[PDB]
Amino acid sequence: TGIQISGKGFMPISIIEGDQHIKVIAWLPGVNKEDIILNAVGDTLEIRAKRSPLMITESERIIYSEIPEEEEIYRTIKLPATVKEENASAKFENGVLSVILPKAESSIKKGINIE
Amino acid sequence: TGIQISGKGFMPISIIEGDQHIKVIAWLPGVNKEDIILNAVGDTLEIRAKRSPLMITESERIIYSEIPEEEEIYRTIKLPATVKEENASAKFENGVLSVILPKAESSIKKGINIE
Amino acid sequence: TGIQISGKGFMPISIIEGDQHIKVIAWLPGVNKEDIILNAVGDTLEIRAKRSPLMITESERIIYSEIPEEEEIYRTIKLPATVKEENASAKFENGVLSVILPKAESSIKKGINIE
Amino acid sequence: TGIQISGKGFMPISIIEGDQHIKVIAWLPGVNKEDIILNAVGDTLEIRAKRSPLMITESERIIYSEIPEEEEIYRTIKLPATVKEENASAKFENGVLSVILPKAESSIKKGINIE
Amino acid sequence: TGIQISGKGFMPISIIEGDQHIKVIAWLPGVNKEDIILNAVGDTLEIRAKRSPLMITESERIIYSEIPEEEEIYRTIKLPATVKEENASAKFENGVLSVILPKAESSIKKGINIE
Amino acid sequence: TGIQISGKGFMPISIIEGDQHIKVIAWLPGVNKEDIILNAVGDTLEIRAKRSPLMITESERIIYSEIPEEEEIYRTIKLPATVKEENASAKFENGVLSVILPKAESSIKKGINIE
Amino acid sequence: TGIQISGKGFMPISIIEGDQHIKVIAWLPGVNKEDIILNAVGDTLEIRAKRSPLMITESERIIYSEIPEEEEIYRTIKLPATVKEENASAKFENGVLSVILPKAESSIKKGINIE
Amino acid sequence: TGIQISGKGFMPISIIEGDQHIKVIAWLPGVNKEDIILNAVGDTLEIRAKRSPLMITESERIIYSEIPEEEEIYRTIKLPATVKEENASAKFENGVLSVILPKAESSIKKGINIE
Amino acid sequence: TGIQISGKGFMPISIIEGDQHIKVIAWLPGVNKEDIILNAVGDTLEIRAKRSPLMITESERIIYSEIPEEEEIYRTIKLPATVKEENASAKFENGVLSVILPKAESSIKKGINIE
Amino acid sequence: TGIQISGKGFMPISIIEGDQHIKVIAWLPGVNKEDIILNAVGDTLEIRAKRSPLMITESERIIYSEIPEEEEIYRTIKLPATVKEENASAKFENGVLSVILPKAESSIKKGINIE
Amino acid sequence: TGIQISGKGFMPISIIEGDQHIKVIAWLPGVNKEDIILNAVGDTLEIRAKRSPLMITESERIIYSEIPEEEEIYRTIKLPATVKEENASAKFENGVLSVILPKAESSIKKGINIE
Amino acid sequence: TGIQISGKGFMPISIIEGDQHIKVIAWLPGVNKEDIILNAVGDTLEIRAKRSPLMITESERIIYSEIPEEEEIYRTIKLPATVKEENASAKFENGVLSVILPKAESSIKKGINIE
Amino acid sequence: TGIQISGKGFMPISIIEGDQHIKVIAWLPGVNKEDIILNAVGDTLEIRAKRSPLMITESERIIYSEIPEEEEIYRTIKLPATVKEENASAKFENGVLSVILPKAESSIKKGINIE
Amino acid sequence: TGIQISGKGFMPISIIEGDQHIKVIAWLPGVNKEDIILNAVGDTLEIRAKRSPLMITESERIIYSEIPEEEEIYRTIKLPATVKEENASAKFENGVLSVILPKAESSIKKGINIE
Amino acid sequence: TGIQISGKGFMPISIIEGDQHIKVIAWLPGVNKEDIILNAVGDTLEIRAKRSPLMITESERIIYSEIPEEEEIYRTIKLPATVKEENASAKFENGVLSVILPKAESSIKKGINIE
Amino acid sequence: TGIQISGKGFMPISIIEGDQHIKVIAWLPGVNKEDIILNAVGDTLEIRAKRSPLMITESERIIYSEIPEEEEIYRTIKLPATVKEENASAKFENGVLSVILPKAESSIKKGINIE
Incomplete structure (x- = not known):
């Protein structure tokens, strides 16, 4: 449905998109702050x-x-x-x-008039 | 199976028994420290x-x-x-x-080593 | 379901438990003021x-x-x-x-500190 | 069976026909006097x-x-x-x-007696 | 058999249809001449x-x-x-x-006038 | 479907609607002018x-x-x-x-406008 | 069955053979005389x-x-x-x-004498 | 419901009824004001x-x-x-x-007050 | 089929392509002109x-x-x-x-001669 | 088996095929010479x-x-x-x-040598 | 179906039937002019x-x-x-x-007058 | 498939056609040249x-x-x-x-030139 | 299977890919020279x-x-x-x-040494 | 599942990813060193x-x-x-x-801080 | 089929058999020569x-x-x-x-050369 | 399964085969060291x-x-x-x-020359 997901174990997530950025939601019970690795690039x-x-x-x-x-x-x-x-x-x-996640400039959508 | 659990929604829980006590573990993602009500009496x-x-x-x-x-x-x-x-x-x-959960001394069993 | 109910005829009922009291509802259409018998003891x-x-x-x-x-x-x-x-x-x-129904002091749950 | 009933929800009803009228009974538990609307015409x-x-x-x-x-x-x-x-x-x-409700047909009461 | 008859009590009936009328035979033992109410309207x-x-x-x-x-x-x-x-x-x-029941003039079926 | 048809034998038919009439068509292979019966009334x-x-x-x-x-x-x-x-x-x-079949004027439904 | 039929569309037919000829029957509802083209050769x-x-x-x-x-x-x-x-x-x-259809002379049956 | 609907093709419909009138809702996407034919009579x-x-x-x-x-x-x-x-x-x-749709005088129902 | 669509609710749509532009067709019954937001970029x-x-x-x-x-x-x-x-x-x-939507030059096709 | 046999009644038969002719046998007990009708043509x-x-x-x-x-x-x-x-x-x-029955010239089979 | 077709491989074909002739249509993609062998007699x-x-x-x-x-x-x-x-x-x-394919004279069908 | 075969006993066979002739193949194990009879005519x-x-x-x-x-x-x-x-x-x-088997003159096909 | 093909109608196509170029092969029988339109860009x-x-x-x-x-x-x-x-x-x-189709520079794949 | 594979014949494979590179695994029984060609580009x-x-x-x-x-x-x-x-x-x-496969620069992932 | 094979693990095999010896083929991807255990006796x-x-x-x-x-x-x-x-x-x-596997002389079969 | 087992009473047993010996295990609850009788011969x-x-x-x-x-x-x-x-x-x-159980020395499988 416009996105692909993969990984091991159970992991609830949710994603929100704005006009300038995206918000990511994740459930990681019982983990210490140092036990987390998060890396990203591009999209x-x-x-x-x-x-x-x-x-x-x-x-x-x-x-x-x-x-x-x-x-x-x-x-x-x-x-x-x-x-x-x-x-x-x-x-x-x-x-x-x-x-x-701030949106990249190319991703910024544009409006169009309606008459 | 000797004990029962009930409630609404999705909630992981685990239960452990000790000699002097019983330990209860539960996952409460997205719950602020003050948002919890916990009550116990007897068993x-x-x-x-x-x-x-x-x-x-x-x-x-x-x-x-x-x-x-x-x-x-x-x-x-x-x-x-x-x-x-x-x-x-x-x-x-x-x-x-x-x-x-401290076990009641009356509840506390007396392990015997014999042979 | 942890509690039992029985009787004869159609008599819709609903029960609500509060920290200090229990509220209960019963559908009794077309019954006169003098026709009702109520009794409660213990639980x-x-x-x-x-x-x-x-x-x-x-x-x-x-x-x-x-x-x-x-x-x-x-x-x-x-x-x-x-x-x-x-x-x-x-x-x-x-x-x-x-x-x-007021709840007995013995039955009233005790809260515990969270730390 | 010569008569039709319809609506939504649970509503026990009884229909009584007299020689000069028809009486109707409806069970409305918990319904206030002003909340009920009654309308009729013809039959x-x-x-x-x-x-x-x-x-x-x-x-x-x-x-x-x-x-x-x-x-x-x-x-x-x-x-x-x-x-x-x-x-x-x-x-x-x-x-x-x-x-x-008085019956309009009863107010007419047709008769064409023959041998 | 495609036609509805209803009522109370024992009252055998035979219904005969003609092209110009309908003839009906009914058993009414023990009923006086003035005690028979007969009514018809429409069909x-x-x-x-x-x-x-x-x-x-x-x-x-x-x-x-x-x-x-x-x-x-x-x-x-x-x-x-x-x-x-x-x-x-x-x-x-x-x-x-x-x-x-002389249904002799209330309709006249169309005929063959083909040319 | 708003109109009912029945009978015995093979007889294709089709139905038309007119502003002031109704047209109906029947295939009658090999049938002489004299063998035919057609009667109609009302609807x-x-x-x-x-x-x-x-x-x-x-x-x-x-x-x-x-x-x-x-x-x-x-x-x-x-x-x-x-x-x-x-x-x-x-x-x-x-x-x-x-x-x-010229249509009954009362049956004609016309004369509604938009604004 | 010793005879074959083919074509397209709806077309009831029945065939009758004479000792000297063959007669054929065809259902053509709604056709004008000129609309049809009948041809033949051989069998x-x-x-x-x-x-x-x-x-x-x-x-x-x-x-x-x-x-x-x-x-x-x-x-x-x-x-x-x-x-x-x-x-x-x-x-x-x-x-x-x-x-x-006049049957051909060789097509016409020939009978062997009694002996 | 006591209402019927028929026709051909795709045409979403909704139906409201008023005490003194009846209001009708129809989706006709992709239509010009002049292309629409509507007519009404009786009920x-x-x-x-x-x-x-x-x-x-x-x-x-x-x-x-x-x-x-x-x-x-x-x-x-x-x-x-x-x-x-x-x-x-x-x-x-x-x-x-x-x-x-202004409702007919005969159609207009009579409310009944509670006595 | 090489094109992806998503969203919520009921929304008829169709798409047309030419050598230099894209045409979009959608059904929005009952909406007011300002209630619609459309943005796009890239593809x-x-x-x-x-x-x-x-x-x-x-x-x-x-x-x-x-x-x-x-x-x-x-x-x-x-x-x-x-x-x-x-x-x-x-x-x-x-x-x-x-x-x-005019097509972007880089994506814009070029005709290729055949000999 | 390349040939067909049909008729009514009990009529046992047998067929014999020669190089220049065909002989056929049929059981007809109790039938007079004047009662028999036999006709053959072609094959x-x-x-x-x-x-x-x-x-x-x-x-x-x-x-x-x-x-x-x-x-x-x-x-x-x-x-x-x-x-x-x-x-x-x-x-x-x-x-x-x-x-x-003598066989036709074409039917008559010519013996073919071996080299 | 009045005509028989056989052979090995893929070769779309369609048949046309003239009163004085017969025209045949076949797809032979990817073939040089000389690579076809065709011969026919009779029908x-x-x-x-x-x-x-x-x-x-x-x-x-x-x-x-x-x-x-x-x-x-x-x-x-x-x-x-x-x-x-x-x-x-x-x-x-x-x-x-x-x-x-020009037809043979015997192939020529003879029109039949209708009365 | 346009060709039919019959006989008694076990006798695998295969058939060959050329532009000038027909070649026939048969398995007759254990048979001496003298015990064989073959006959042919026409086709x-x-x-x-x-x-x-x-x-x-x-x-x-x-x-x-x-x-x-x-x-x-x-x-x-x-x-x-x-x-x-x-x-x-x-x-x-x-x-x-x-x-x-040398073909008959009618059997040998005549090539048709291309245009 | 990692490649996309699309369109309407009957059009057999076999695709072949060379290291330096792409050769495209298709069957378009029964069309005229000029009615062929082939355009491409990118991939x-x-x-x-x-x-x-x-x-x-x-x-x-x-x-x-x-x-x-x-x-x-x-x-x-x-x-x-x-x-x-x-x-x-x-x-x-x-x-x-x-x-x-001569391949694009960035598409040309490079061999890797083997050890 | 985010990766696509195609080809003909039997060839077991497995894939591994690192933070700087990608490692590929394949079973090729019965192959001399000279008959294997590997090429790649981009991704x-x-x-x-x-x-x-x-x-x-x-x-x-x-x-x-x-x-x-x-x-x-x-x-x-x-x-x-x-x-x-x-x-x-x-x-x-x-x-x-x-x-x-050493990764390209743009492929190189970037870690992002958390608090 | 008079010959049987068994064992665990994936191991494609093909048996070959000479007149003076017997040859066999086994697929063993990723097996160092030193990890190979092979043993036989008799047949x-x-x-x-x-x-x-x-x-x-x-x-x-x-x-x-x-x-x-x-x-x-x-x-x-x-x-x-x-x-x-x-x-x-x-x-x-x-x-x-x-x-x-050199075949035992007992297994070795002696040819027979007679007409 | 190449081996046979029999006897009376409750006796879980396990069998293990090695390269030069065979090991056997038996559960003997409540049995005194001298209560056992053990005999074996051949296989x-x-x-x-x-x-x-x-x-x-x-x-x-x-x-x-x-x-x-x-x-x-x-x-x-x-x-x-x-x-x-x-x-x-x-x-x-x-x-x-x-x-x-040290298995017979003759049972040893050996002989293949390992290059």
Whole structure:
């Protein structure tokens, strides 16, 4: 549907497009700020992250779990437009990752009169 | 299977039992530290929480998303054994919740080494 | 579903639990002020009521009817928590009964600090 | 069966035909006096009403309810005979509406007796 | 059999259609000459009758009965074609009614005038 | 579909609408002027016909034939609007029947404008 | 079956063979005499025709038809025996075509004596 | 509903009804004000119109289209109530048609007050 | 098929190509001239629109509709060639949108001689 | 098998093919010389006959019978090669018909040498 | 279907039938004028042709194709009529083959007058 | 496919045509030159043969055998053209039979020049 | 399969790609020299043509045709590499269309040393 | 899934990406070093090879084989990034091909800060 | 088929058989000579080996593969003839393995030369 | 599967084959070291033992038990190859038996000359 996505593991994401930039939304619970790698260029975006396994005491044991445990996970997406990555910015809080990607000049759409 | 869990929406949770305590783990992405209500007595656990919606500018618009949008979500659990909630504790970081539940000394089993 | 309900006839009912009280609703069309029996104890609730049959003039005849004709009906309910029925209150209007059940101090959940 | 009924939502109704009139019964739980609209002409009758769902207070946690809650509801009925609407009458108490309409055909009362 | 007959009580009827009229034979045992109400309009016919009440008593221990005293009995017949009610005629003998419905002039089917 | 047709035998037909009339067409292969029946009233039409069977000489024998053998054929049709059958006309040539049905003025729907 | 038929369009036909000739029957609703071209040689017959389409008025519209639309139609049939086309004859009436085919002398059956 | 709809081709429709009138909504994309034929009488509606096909130059060609090409299209409607066609009005804008149908005096229903 | 389309809601569209320009065809019933936003660049065409809700008087109600009720709708198209947006023009009438996009020289085809 | 046999009734037959002629055998028990009709031309043959029923005196009764009762019987046969029916010779004796038919010159097969 | 067609390979063909002749149309793409062998007699036509394989350069490999490859191709057709080959003619250009077959006199059909 | 074959026994065959002749091929294993009979005329071919059974010694017995043992066998064929049998020649060696049939003058086709 | 082909109508095309150029091969039988339009740029190439219909005299008609009749046809293709149209060359004979595309500089692939 | 591969024959492959380059893996059994051609450019890479067929001795026979027989084979793959072919390197050992594609500058990804 | 093979792992194989020896072919991509385990005796042969997995640098990642990842593989074969295993020989070049098995003189078959 | 197993009682067993020996494992819960009988010869192995029953004290009484009570238990296993039982060994700990079966030296497979 105008975009392609790939990667390993589970990863909720969402994308918002403006007239000058694009906002990226991602869910990465249980990760330390340093465990994240995000690289981009042109119109392509890459997300890489690793989470610690849930340690347990020798006396302790798990009766039940829902959480997938695979530590390494990443997701790749092709955007609908080219961006100026060098000016991009991102915020991460509450296990959630936030990104801002300025649009490239060529991508800036233009209006047309209607009569 | 000896315990039951209930609630609305999508919410990962994990449960672990210790000799002196029981440990509960849950993922609360998009929840501010103060947005959480957590209540416990005896051997039953309850959780309620609200995550802000995805804000957008009139120019901006959502193109793709799998993340569910509903804000308020909750979870309820019945433990297998009684706990001393008065001494329990909870720690929440990076959109993930952990809770320490002291087992009742009456509930605390007596491992015997014999042969 | 964690609670049980039974009885005879059609008597739509809905239950709402509040931190300090429980609100319950029952559809009772066409029933007079004197026909209603209410009883609650511990964490269970009972209702019994009787509606006069459809009287008609000798020259009249019922050509069509979807309204059920039975007079007496009752319903049993298991509450999830104990209530202080002695201080409860209820009201009936427009064929519907409204109830408020104060919750016992023992049953009232305790909140725990988050850190 | 010589008479037709239609509308939306749940609305039990009873039709009673007299030698000089037709009486109609409608169950409208929780419906206020001013919210109900009654209209008729010829040999057809129509009903409109709307019910306010509820108000939230405190936690306001409700389990799977047995009571329906569609707000707007109406019903239309074709009578077997023409009625004199200008002389009709209606009353609503205990959540049930009662209506009596004199029959225009009865005001004519044709007869061509032969051997 | 493509035509509708309805009513209450036991009242055998035979409907005969002519090219200029409709003739109907009906069984009305025990009904007086003045007790038979006959009405017609458009393409429908109404037959109404009442027989002697023939009450019940005691000190007899009724030993046998096949004759019902049901007084008010009627039948509604959907005629296949329009009739001129003002010109109808009938004869009643030995509890059997012989009606004539002269639909002789209310329409005249087109004919062959081909050239 | 707003008009109904039935009958026995093979009889193709087609229907037309006119501003002040209705045209109807019927294929009647091998039918003589005298074998034909056409009657109509109101908004319904009837057709009956009978065609002589396949005659054969004593010295001849039918080695193959696909043409049906039945002689009598007929059709009945419900028209969509009222017609003034007294003014109708029809023509039959080359085994095909054409009929002209002037429409009832009351049935004519004209005289609405846009602004 | 010792004989073949082919062509396009709707064309009922029946064939009858005489000891000295062969007679053929054809259904041609709505065809003008000149519209048809019948030819023959050897033991095969060819029939060509064209039926005018259903002309219409500007205000007119066709609401339904059973009649097929195509105009140009023809059929071909291979006779089992040779004929003397120069002596053939045909008659067409009431949208129906008849043909008489004198059988060739060698085509005409010869009977061996009793012994 | 008591209403019927018919016609050919693609023509989206919606129908509103008023107490004193009836309002009709029709989509007619790609139409000029003069191409539309509408007429009304009694309690039934008809709408007929024509839209030009897609013009093109010999140096241009169709690569992809969803819009159906057939030009002549119409629809018909059977109302549940009679209207006063002579007083009806209609407006057309932005490819959409709005019609106002003053309801007949007999059609106008009588409201019934609750006693 | 070498061209990509996307958006939300119902939006008929068709596309035409010439040697020097691109023509765009779309259906927007019931929209006001200003309610539409269209931008494009490179080979990408964006269409955005918001439609008025079907106004209804309090006494009225929609007995039936086919028109989709959603108000805002938009579409995106990736053309097979590049365009000079700054020179484009568009006309809109009768609920239809017309847009002409001159092709970009670099993308503009060249004729190739054949010998 | 390159040839066809047809007819009615029990008529066993056998066919014998020579270099210069064809001989054919047919079982016709109980048929008179005057009852037989045989006709052949080209490379096909016809046989027609009739056998009288079994007579008995009125006092006599058939205690056992396997012999068939039907009288009229016939057969038709297609040869694989043309025959000169002029020179045909037939012999009927003991309820069996024998016939020899010289073959046509073209039918006559020339012996071909081996080198 | 009155004519037989056979042969190996791909060779589109169509047949035309003159009253004095027969014209045949065949597609023989990629063939040099001399590479066709054609011969015919009676009412049967034989066509033989061979094409060079689609040559390739030593440093050339085919990415994609659909054209069938077999070099020799032939077809045979049995006409419904006898012809005079000695007088025939044919043309071949633009990879398309044309042939003219004058009919035999016996092939000439004789028109039949109709009465 | 325009050619038909018949006979009894096992006899694989293949057929060859040239511009000047026809060549025929047959497998007749275990058959001596003297046991073969072949005949032909016009455009049809006959084959007849008989193979000596396998003799067996008294001390010897057949353990297993796939070979069909029927001695006499024959085949019949209809050629696609007429031949001149008086000049035929055939070879039989290595258990395989070959035949060369010079064409008839009508059989040899005449080339048609191209324009 | 990594390459795009498109267009309407019947147009066989086989594509071949050389290291230094692209050769394009297509079958366009039955078209005139000038009705061929081939244009290209970048990495995409277009083909348009029209073919005369099979004309006939009124005395003439058809027995059978395999050739499709539609007249306008075209095809478009996206090559794997960009070209320099200016040096393009093409030949068309015998209904076969040949085109040569010298490859663009940036497209010329470079061999890699092997170890 | 973002990468495309095509070709004919059997040739297992696998692909790897690095931050400076791309590594390619391929199985090529039975290939001498000389018969493999590798070329690539930009983001396009092609592999061509031909293997000697399995020669055999006159006395020899193939009883069973799994290996496919085709000799010429190739593959094409379009990479996710463009490379600097001139710097590439490819090691071939043990019937397996290894290739190194140093990434081009614009392909080089850029990391972006987070807070 | 009288010969069987078994084992785990992917290993295409083809058996060849001489008169004085037997040849066999095995595909073993990525198998170092030292990882090769092959053993046989009498008329049965064994094959076993392990392949190193594809290593990667931490920065590197697998995007797509077809390579089978199982390492340890082997095969077992029953040969149809005994061999002098002590006299066998093998060759392993470019990932393809070949072997020669001198056949035991007992297995060696003695030719028979008679007419 | 080349080996056979038999015996009585509950006895999980595992079999492992090496290059020069064969290893066998058996579960012997509750069996004393001396309770076992172990014998083997050629390529078959025998194991027999008797395990004591479940004793109970005077005051005791058995309420539940799953363990089978049968004392005598044995198993018979025919090995695939002959073994050097004279050199075999066995080891039994924690109720589980292990046995080493050095297989016959003659069974060794060797002889292939590795280049």
